[PDB]
Design a protein around this ligand. Sequence first.
Ligand SMILES: CC(=O)N[C@@H]([C@@H](O)[C@H](O)[C@H](O)CO)[C@@H](O)CC(=O)C(=O)O
Ligand SMILES: CC(=O)N[C@@H]([C@@H](O)[C@H](O)[C@H](O)CO)[C@@H](O)CC(=O)C(=O)O
Ligand SMILES: CC(=O)N[C@@H]([C@@H](O)[C@H](O)[C@H](O)CO)[C@@H](O)CC(=O)C(=O)O
Ligand SMILES: CC(=O)N[C@@H]([C@@H](O)[C@H](O)[C@H](O)CO)[C@@H](O)CC(=O)C(=O)O
Lengths: 304, 304, 304, 304
Amino acid sequence: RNLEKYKGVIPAFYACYDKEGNISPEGVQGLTKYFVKKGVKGVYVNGSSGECIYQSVEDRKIVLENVMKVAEGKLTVIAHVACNNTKDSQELARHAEGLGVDAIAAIPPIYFHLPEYAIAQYWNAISAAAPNTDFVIYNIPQLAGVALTQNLFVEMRKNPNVIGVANSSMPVQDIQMFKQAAGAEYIIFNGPDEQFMSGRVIGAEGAIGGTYGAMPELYLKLDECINAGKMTEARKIQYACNEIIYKMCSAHGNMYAVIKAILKINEGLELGAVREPLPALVDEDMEIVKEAAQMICDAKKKFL
Amino acid sequence: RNLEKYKGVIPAFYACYDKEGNISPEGVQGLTKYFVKKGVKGVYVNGSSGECIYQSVEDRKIVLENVMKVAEGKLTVIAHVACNNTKDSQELARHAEGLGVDAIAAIPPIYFHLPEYAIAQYWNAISAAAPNTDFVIYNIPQLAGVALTQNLFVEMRKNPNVIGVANSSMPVQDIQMFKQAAGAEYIIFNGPDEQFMSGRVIGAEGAIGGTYGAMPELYLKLDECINAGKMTEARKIQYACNEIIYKMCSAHGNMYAVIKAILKINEGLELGAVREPLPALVDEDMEIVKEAAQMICDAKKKFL
Amino acid sequence: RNLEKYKGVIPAFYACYDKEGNISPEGVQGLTKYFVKKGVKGVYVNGSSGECIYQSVEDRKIVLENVMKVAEGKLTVIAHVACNNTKDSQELARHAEGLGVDAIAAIPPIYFHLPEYAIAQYWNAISAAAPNTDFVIYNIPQLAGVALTQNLFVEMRKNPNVIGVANSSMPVQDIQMFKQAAGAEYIIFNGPDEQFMSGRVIGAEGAIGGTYGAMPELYLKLDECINAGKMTEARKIQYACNEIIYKMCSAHGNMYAVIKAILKINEGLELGAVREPLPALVDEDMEIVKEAAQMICDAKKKFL
Amino acid sequence: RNLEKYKGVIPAFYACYDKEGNISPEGVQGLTKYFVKKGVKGVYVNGSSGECIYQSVEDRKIVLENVMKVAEGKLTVIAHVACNNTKDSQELARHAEGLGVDAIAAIPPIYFHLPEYAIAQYWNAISAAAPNTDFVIYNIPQLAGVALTQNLFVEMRKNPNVIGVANSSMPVQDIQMFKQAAGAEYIIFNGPDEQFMSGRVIGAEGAIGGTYGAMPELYLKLDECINAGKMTEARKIQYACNEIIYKMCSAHGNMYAVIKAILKINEGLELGAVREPLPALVDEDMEIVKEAAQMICDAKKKFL
Ligand SMILES: CC(=O)N[C@@H]([C@@H](O)[C@H](O)[C@H](O)CO)[C@@H](O)CC(=O)C(=O)O
Ligand SMILES: CC(=O)N[C@@H]([C@@H](O)[C@H](O)[C@H](O)CO)[C@@H](O)CC(=O)C(=O)O
Ligand SMILES: CC(=O)N[C@@H]([C@@H](O)[C@H](O)[C@H](O)CO)[C@@H](O)CC(=O)C(=O)O
Ligand SMILES: CC(=O)N[C@@H]([C@@H](O)[C@H](O)[C@H](O)CO)[C@@H](O)CC(=O)C(=O)O
């Protein structure tokens, strides 16, 4: 199995709202054009970074449709289709296959801690609604409250559409164990942005992150140093990216609200705000937004 | 402030489905008639037990409408209105006020761990969409991933519609601390069914549970023994209820799937199945359903 | 099996030091005389409250010897004998049997998370070093990092010296499950002082606490109200005891440092300080010590 | 500040017992000779891997004395001196300085979750008992139950003897954050063996592990590939070491019991068993011991 189109930097795609807080087709297209021009491997659409939790099935369809209008044939497209219930997730998995996305992805069931067999049934029911599309399993125990165990992964590998795991848990051992267990026909994507270099070297051939969109060139360059085996140059970029993450996370407003504001300053992008309950930016946050935006420009000057 | 209508046994209302898996208006009405006949203080509608997580805003409106259509009697109605996003929760809080429910309730934001100010903003935005209705804060850290802290509770007590907390966390100290801090104009509802008697004596004047619907008379009798100060007889009913809970939880199928099946055997109620991803009953579960239904009949005979 | 001598209030015995920080035989004797005069059911010697973690095997022998030298009266003596390694725990279990203590107690192995079979081997090796003495399993997962599971408890009940569990975990369901499973020949001791009344009514016939020593009469009165079925008066004492606990815990200095200081003010007892690494009291703590000591006097006046 | 002598592979030194379970001076010397001949940077003496938790102050003195007789001037020596109480830890810190060890190390206080100021006081009291010796702080939240926070680390950096952190927590971000915060005059040691390569590239210039002693050459070679920037060869060794770890951890007997047994098979070393409560090997474990020992020989043949 050939998974080359999934190897590299795949930024998680942000939610693009107009001035009223509705999904902006124009906004979505503009952010996709930004990603095409920046030369990233692909986009991870309607994930946690895309505020999926807060969107309707229709909101999520519009996002993907407008992503495809611009990225179809140009970028690799992974659409996250998981919803609270199974029927909404199946509708999105069907819709995604209709647009010809490269892969569909799903986080586990949330809120309740469902047994392993219920998680496997949920994922396979989604996969069956898109029977010709590749499938990425999301391991995010911090948020979902349930983890992808080695046994659940063995069970999921029985589904031939399953191409691998997007690992957002903090231990890099999880990436190593998933990779070693699955072998060469599977791909592990690195989830913690702050550990990008560490996840990549231990076996993650993929990378999906929520902070990539704020500085795509830094991650591409980081990935370039990793591939070259230039670890000192990699370490130096990693520390600069993390220093920016910690700054974006020190705000009152949500990290994604900070990022959208940065993209206005650095790129003239109009992405709207964050959907409630995510906290919006306050006046005091503007200095944080400006300092982080400048840290990005300064890190690009220093490392590109 | 008078909170007498909230004191006593308030079973969490189950998700009543037709044979196609859609909300059954007929089904909802029948389960409401059941609770009226059982003489419970009220009903907690569209909570976790009512599979709220898996319902649409429209599904949740239909449930409440059909509950109210029958709750002409002595049912104190608490409608849980919290949804993944704020605008869906506001729509439900408005709709509930239009039907004249006694109170509205909300779990915290889920999946992401939002700061305290974002949680308070979420709850107050819901409360503002129903400005004349009483408000219940739901503390369920096991599932929501965030807890109602003492400071967040002090902050929420600034909202005059807030009448108290529905405490589902395991420490009874949480009930004691919330009660002591809030005083006499507030009510704490006991969430863990298995600790009913323990929560009640330390200060919970209310009780909301997901297993009450399966044996309402046992809990009413338990509450009667508590009020009388009959601790030995309370203990005997508590242990019998918990013995039934552990049996209902030993099934492959979800606890709520087991309960609906029991209500078919013991009360001829047609409630449908559980919505996916909740796991349905399997053939092996039929014996557990039959045995727990009998344990209920035998416990009623022994204690009523 | 008759366990009447273990039913009631059993304060955890504090580490009595001389002005040089060494075990005070005189000090120990004086605190034992205190508990005899206070009319408590017994004493729990060399537990976490007795700073066992920080004592040598010799320190722990001296404490028990001087307790026994005075516990001529009606003190049911439970000696905690668990040490980091097994051989130190066996030496203490043997020594305790030589002094004719009523029971020996043990926390699980700490620091490393040892499998269930290693925990059972540890406890049975201790029990075998005192083959004629009663045995108490201590469940304290917050501190030990391992919990007494239902299966480990079934395994331990094969040892005839095991008389029950001292439950310090926060869920009262743990007391209920241990009691229901073990039956009438076993005793469950209530560990969380702040939930005393809640633990007692759900099935704990015993009570061991670290704050009992600071206000023995309040707990005795609380227990008296419980037994009488006076839930309203029990609640009033419970809330007054918890209000004192939270005040004793608001200090910079360790809770046990605060308690010893209170016993100096209220009972003229000379108990020394707390052994490092436990933090000592600071100047700012004197007011908290003075206020909590007064809260104790005022609560005795109000409830006795 | 020059920390070159701490950079590289520093295996945690095992507890060497004679046939009765006492500390064997001859045994200790023999294991030190093994480490000298294998060409590792140094040894981490009386850590968790050296069963410190289960040793007396005298046991720990004998170990270090016999380590020094053989390693003094030849290997870098880091002695872990932390005990349950402060006075035992000070006695060991003094004793270690008397033998002229390169550095002393300490885990935080255990069992109780002590406030940050109590942890800092504990470590500085140890450091003051060895005022001319370098100091390594151990971050091991999984076992200690308390973590080294960024604030506690800022506080500890005020002590000029503090040379860095030995990070055993699972997130590599912890290594990155400690390093970035401390700068060039500090060293971070990698604790999780299974993430060696990942910890090293993100900023850990040091490495201390409990499995190093079982295959020193594999880790030295791994470290050599890392330094060369040969990441594919590094990944291949990492996966082979982890495959051996998982095998050593699948036994009934404790991982350290398995390692000592392997050193008997592969090196003819007589290290004794593990001190109770650590579980000993069973007959069924011998096949696991032999297979893992062979996996070591086969991995050395394949990668050296
Ligand atoms: C816990 C979490 O949200 N993890 C993020 C990270 O990319 C995260 O934004 C980053 O590491 C900053 O903390 C992703 O793995 C998940 C994500 O972007 C998505 O699913 O949309
Ligand atoms: C964690 C949880 O779901 N707890 C239950 C308890 O009533 C009960 O202990 C549970 O239903 C059965 O054990 C409720 O608090 C939740 C509930 O009824 C609701 O929110 O609808
Ligand atoms: C976690 C903990 O230490 N709990 C205490 C409780 O008695 C009490 O809640 C605590 O001392 C004060 O809150 C006891 O169970 C421990 C104890 O007294 C002992 O082992 O000596
Ligand atoms: C949690 C734990 O014990 N971690 C170990 C690891 O080296 C461990 O043995 C290894 O990663 C295998 O799991 C070390 O970091 C600690 C250690 O060796 C010591 O302090 O002696």
